[PDB]
């Protein structure tokens, strides 16, 4: 109850954010002071990418993309258990049995991803070997 004190805190952090932005624009010495060689926009050499010194010119695997997609179901499962947390008492045994069913259905989803090895990054593009066999004629 009564969040006026929290509201002022939210305002203060927002105001404090601009102070992080603005303090640099005032404290730093101007370009002419250090070497004057050029502005940030003009100094393309400095205002450029870093590639260990030498100039150069994310197709991520299926698993990494598959782990991210599977986060959406499992996160909705966990975030839908919130109603049971604040009402674990009143729903009594009936809620507890329903709750376990609501997980056992989702365990089958957990079981299914376990067997197919969908999470593993997998290494099929390489690491192949063969046994040398003489072919006498």
């Amino acid at each position: 109850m009564l969040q006026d004190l929290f509201n002022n805190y939210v305002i203060l952090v927002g105001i404090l954010g601009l102070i992080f932005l603005g303090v640099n624009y005032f404290i730093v010495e101007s370009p002419r002071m250090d070497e004057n060689n050029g502005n940030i926009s003009d100094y393309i050499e400095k205002s450029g990418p870093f590639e260990c010194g030498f100039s150069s010119f994310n197709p991520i695997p299926i698993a990494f993309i598959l782990v991210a997609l599977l986060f959406l179901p499992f996160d909705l499962e966990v975030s839908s258990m919130l109603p049971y947390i604040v009402s674990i008492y009143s729903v009594g045994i009936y809620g507890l049995i329903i709750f376990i069913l609501f997980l056992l259905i989702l365990i089958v989803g957990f079981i299914y991803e376990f067997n197919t090895k969908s999470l593993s990054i997998t290494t099929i593009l390489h690491k192949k070997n063969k046994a040398l066999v003489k072919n006498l004629y």
């Binding site: 259905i105 089958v108 079981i111 299914y112």
Partner: protein, 506 residues
Amino acid sequence: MLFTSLLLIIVYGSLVNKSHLLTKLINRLGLIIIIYTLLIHLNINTLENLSIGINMFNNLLLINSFNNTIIELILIICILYVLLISFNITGLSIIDNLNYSKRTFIVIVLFNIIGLTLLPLVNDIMILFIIIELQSYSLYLLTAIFNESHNSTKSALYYFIVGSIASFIILDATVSIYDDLGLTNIQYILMYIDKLEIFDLLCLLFGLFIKIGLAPFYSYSITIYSLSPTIITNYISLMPKLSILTLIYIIMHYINIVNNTDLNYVISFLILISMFIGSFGGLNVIRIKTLLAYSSLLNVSYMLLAILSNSNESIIAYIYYIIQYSLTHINIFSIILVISIYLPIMNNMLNVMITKYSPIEYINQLKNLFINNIFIAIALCISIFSLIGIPPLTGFYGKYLVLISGLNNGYVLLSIVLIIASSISTVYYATILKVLSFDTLSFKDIISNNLIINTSPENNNNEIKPEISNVISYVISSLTLIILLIIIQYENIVKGAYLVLLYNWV
């Protein structure tokens, strides 16, 4: 029965190795699961005891003798459908190995069957918006089952986007009704049927109209059906209409309590346009799946005329129509999946590219079917003739009963248009029949060992080796004679339609 064994198949599916023999046998277990569901359902559900309507699960689901029949219809069509993947259709491994590669094909079907059957039974908006998603998602997953294909994936992406828009339209209407009344259960809303904004139920139907592909939303359904593999299009072009046309009928039953004149005109505007587009659309097309996609739009147009009229003759007309069009749709797509073995082979012109997903794609690939397999062609001709409406095939009574309900309620304009669109459509059903037989005698003397079926080795050259599988040929034969010989049992079957009740009582 579905829920208990679907989880068993999901766990068992990944435990065994990925082999087309183990996948096919697992597909048969899908057939056994569906068969048991039908026996268990028929055992406990009867038309006599469901006439009143029996609330279930805290009044979330309500089942009566009308929704009960469609559930039995949905299960039976699925049994015939799974025979397409649980058994060989052609026999040649090249074209049949597409049905055995994906293990989760049957699992996704069983996910959709649970969604299909529960959708007509929804009695609350909270469970309506859920059950429509359980069915809708199962369609998008099904359309993308073959992820190596480029067309199948692009079909599902196009299907996902439009289906999500339809879901949002459906969701928005239910929220609007909730905002006016504050109630959720449909039976509670029926008390306030005279004080809610009736068009919000129309906005609800506009969402359901998109999912079944009604004009002006027809554009995507034709594109999607013409692109997905023939094994996929057979299921996504028929099943969603079985479980949504029934839901539309139940909502229309509620709406006719007030008998809003403005609402009929708007829906009649869509019905009138659909017959135009569904008839003139297929005149200039070269693809067989695009033609049947336009045929589906026109036969959805005919059924919606019965639903809009919504009287005691509509139940008789809609129940009979939905059953007969379903078997005929199964019969045609069963034949098109089998007559792919007579295709010629080159040894070029137009550089026509035929992929293993849709071996039969153009209408002119049915040439000389009267020569190659005359009995199959007659089955195809009979199925085509039913859609035309040649009496006494099952198709004729479908239009006869729709016209009775349409004219009984004063839909004189739509009835005359439905007939004209029936005559216009006959042009592009006769084209299929022209392709099959009209050149039989000019090609009676032909030298051709260049068929796909001729690739198989000769096993013994003495024993008689049938060209087609046993099960798939028997389904075509069983469905062909049902359409042709319905005249015998029509009076009794229509009596079975009299007993179907949706709060008629007395």
